[PDB]
Scaffold this active site. Structure first.
Site, mmCIF file in Angstrom:
data_model
loop_
_atom_site.group_PDB
_atom_site.id
_atom_site.type_symbol
_atom_site.label_atom_id
_atom_site.label_comp_id
_atom_site.label_asym_id
_atom_site.label_seq_id
_atom_site.Cartn_x
_atom_site.Cartn_y
_atom_site.Cartn_z
ATOM 1 N N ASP A 118 1.064 -0.987 -0.146
ATOM 2 C CA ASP A 118 -0.022 -0.145 0.038
ATOM 3 C C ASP A 118 0.710 1.292 -0.174
ATOM 4 O OD1 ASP A 118 -2.001 2.101 0.615
ATOM 5 O OD2 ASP A 118 -2.939 1.005 2.169
ATOM 6 N N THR A 119 1.321 1.817 -1.220
ATOM 7 C CA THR A 119 2.015 2.948 -1.242
ATOM 8 C C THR A 119 1.439 4.243 -0.832
ATOM 9 O OG1 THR A 119 1.511 3.382 -3.641
ATOM 10 C CG2 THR A 119 3.362 2.044 -3.177
ATOM 11 N N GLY A 120 0.084 4.130 -0.654
ATOM 12 C CA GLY A 120 -0.743 5.457 0.069
ATOM 13 C C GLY A 120 -0.682 5.385 1.502
HETATM 14 C C1 LIG Z 1 -6.807 1.073 3.844
HETATM 15 C C2 LIG Z 1 -6.823 0.796 2.344
HETATM 16 C C3 LIG Z 1 -7.088 -0.653 2.218
HETATM 17 C C4 LIG Z 1 -7.436 1.576 1.463
HETATM 18 N N1 LIG Z 1 -7.146 2.991 1.673
HETATM 19 C C5 LIG Z 1 -5.900 3.365 0.772
HETATM 20 C C6 LIG Z 1 -4.702 3.563 1.680
HETATM 21 O O1 LIG Z 1 -3.455 3.794 0.899
HETATM 22 C C7 LIG Z 1 -4.915 4.944 2.351
HETATM 23 C C8 LIG Z 1 -5.031 6.239 1.666
HETATM 24 C C9 LIG Z 1 -4.851 7.430 2.391
HETATM 25 C C10 LIG Z 1 -3.916 8.361 2.691
HETATM 26 C C11 LIG Z 1 -3.879 9.383 3.580
HETATM 27 C C12 LIG Z 1 -5.156 9.537 4.264
HETATM 28 C C13 LIG Z 1 -6.103 8.735 4.336
HETATM 29 C C14 LIG Z 1 -6.067 7.688 3.263
HETATM 30 N N2 LIG Z 1 -3.940 5.081 3.357
HETATM 31 C C15 LIG Z 1 -3.999 4.568 4.777
HETATM 32 O O2 LIG Z 1 -5.107 4.544 5.410
HETATM 33 O O3 LIG Z 1 -2.784 4.986 5.268
HETATM 34 C C16 LIG Z 1 -3.253 4.749 6.988
HETATM 35 C C17 LIG Z 1 -1.868 3.866 7.535
HETATM 36 O O4 LIG Z 1 -0.568 5.014 7.235
HETATM 37 C C18 LIG Z 1 -1.243 6.326 7.382
HETATM 38 O O5 LIG Z 1 -0.668 7.087 6.235
HETATM 39 C C19 LIG Z 1 -1.739 7.694 5.574
HETATM 40 C C20 LIG Z 1 -3.100 7.411 6.219
HETATM 41 C C21 LIG Z 1 -2.656 6.207 7.361
HETATM 42 S S1 LIG Z 1 -8.394 4.067 1.257
HETATM 43 O O6 LIG Z 1 -7.896 5.496 1.308
HETATM 44 O O7 LIG Z 1 -9.274 3.815 2.416
HETATM 45 C C22 LIG Z 1 -9.512 3.957 0.012
HETATM 46 C C23 LIG Z 1 -9.037 3.999 -0.986
HETATM 47 C C24 LIG Z 1 -9.717 3.804 -2.362
HETATM 48 C C25 LIG Z 1 -10.592 3.091 -2.428
HETATM 49 C C26 LIG Z 1 -11.197 2.590 -1.079
HETATM 50 C C27 LIG Z 1 -10.545 2.883 0.110
HETATM 51 O O8 LIG Z 1 -12.103 1.812 -1.119
HETATM 52 C C28 LIG Z 1 -12.428 1.772 -2.570
HETATM 53 O O9 LIG Z 1 -11.700 2.784 -3.153
#
Ligand SMILES: CC(C)CN(C[C@@H](O)[C@H](Cc1ccccc1)NC(=O)O[C@H]1CO[C@H]2OCC[C@H]21)S(=O)(=O)c1ccc2c(c1)OCO2
Lengths: 99, 99
Positions: free
Chosen positions: A25-27
């Site tokens: 998960d690069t995000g």
């Molecule tokens: C949790 C995963 C399975 C899904 N997420 C993408 C993540 O890359 C998300 C993307 C994200 C990035 C920043 C803020 C919120 C979400 N990152 C995230 O939750 O990271 C958390 C852990 O490390 C911390 O750094 C970032 C937030 C914390 S998401 O943002 O909830 C999401 C994105 C597109 C989607 C979706 C869910 O459902 C369908 O399409």
């Protein structure tokens, strides 16, 4: 390997000696794993994602193997919708995005 | 290009005639953009992540340029804390994860 993205980039990890599936998960800044028993000391923390904040157990310096590659670092354990491997450990295994 | 993971993988995008910064996110199935007034019809959707679900508007066949690469597809708009380029568009620009 080189991983294309037509499907979810799911891999097998080993954590606490147990095999699990996780999403590369690069995000994600941080690595977040579902509730489990894990050897190591932990501290209470919060982490926020797309829908708000949750409480997690922060475990530092945890040995974790990711698709056969070794990492040792921080794992947050708590009620996540998905096991995600974030950049704190993707950098350890030498991952980059390419296009 | 090769996009490092020491820092968030942010790139410039163009959508709806506006430039934004967005994450190249292998953990996202879908593309999610911060609230903006895109024209045309849309469908309600809910998407879930850490912390729970948010309400978004689903727009189809949206033109979006990602770090200079053209793409066209579904974009979800709503109160996301981050602009997220998900796999539906990462595949169109030929992105891979490599280690
Ligand atoms: C949790 C995963 C399975 C899904 N997420 C993408 C993540 O890359 C998300 C993307 C994200 C990035 C920043 C803020 C919120 C979400 N990152 C995230 O939750 O990271 C958390 C852990 O490390 C911390 O750094 C970032 C937030 C914390 S998401 O943002 O909830 C999401 C994105 C597109 C989607 C979706 C869910 O459902 C369908 O399409």
């Amino acid at each position: 390997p080189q991983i294309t993205l037509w499907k979810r980039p799911l891999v097998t990890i080993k954590i606490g000696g147990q095999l699990k599936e996780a999403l590369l998960d690069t995000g994600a800044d941080d690595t977040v794993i579902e509730e489990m028993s894990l050897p190591g000391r932990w501290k209470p923390k919060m982490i926020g994602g797309i829908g708000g904040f949750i409480k997690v157990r922060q475990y530092d310096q945890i040995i974790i193997e990711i698709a056969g590659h070794k990492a040792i670092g921080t794992v947050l354990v708590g009620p996540t919708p998905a096991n995600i491997i974030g950049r704190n450990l993707l950098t350890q295994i030498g991952a980059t995005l390419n296009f």
